[PDB]
Design a protein around this ligand. Structure first.
Ligand SMILES: [Cu+2]
Length: 166
């Protein structure tokens, strides 16, 4: 169990630690760390919730629905907080393509992978800090999809992150 705290994930921003910068986020208000589903679950319109019961409100998609963190292209530091550390296989990061439609349901086919970090089947610390590169053809509202792949189960934790690239 874990979430991306910086830039705050859509789920994290639903919690008090995230400033309640997103409202009406279901279970994300209290447990943004709990978005767990089998690896390679990428159901269109169910990316933000990973199809998990109680997280459905996260799946709404419009240009203005969610709070964005202002970022630039180039290097971006990602910080996870893990409420329950687990042996780790992988960390993968995707971002929406230039030209994507922010008023349509999220579809993984409209993202590119932009980073992949081997967890080496080790147990990470409670705070995990990684740097990824944001491609320079992205401007404006984009969604980053951060996926923590568990080493000793068939599951992953899924974190949609709303950013404004300027
Ligand atoms: Cu867990």
């Amino acid at each position: 169990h874990g979430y991306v705290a910086s830039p705050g994930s859509r789920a994290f921003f639903g919690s008090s630690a995230g400033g309640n910068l997103n409202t009406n986020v279901g279970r994300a208000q209290w447990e943004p760390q709990s978005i767990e589903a089998p690896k390679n679950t990428f159901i269109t319109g169910k990316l933000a919730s990973a199809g998990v019961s109680g997280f459905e409100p996260l799946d709404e998609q419009t240009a203005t629905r969610w709070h964005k963190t202002n970022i630039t292209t180039g290097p971006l530091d990602i910080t996870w907080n893990l409420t329950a550390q687990h042996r780790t296989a992988s960390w993968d990061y995707y971002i929406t393509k230039n030209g994507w439609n922010p008023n349509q349901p999220l579809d993984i086919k409209n993202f590119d992978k932009i980073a992949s970090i081997d967890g080496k089947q080790e147990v990470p610390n409670k705070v995990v800090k990684q740097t990824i590169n944001i491609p320079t053809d992205r401007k404006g509202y984009h969604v980053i999809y951060a996926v923590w792949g568990i080493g000793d189960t068939v599951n992953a934790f899924y974190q949609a992150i709303d950013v404004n690239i300027q």
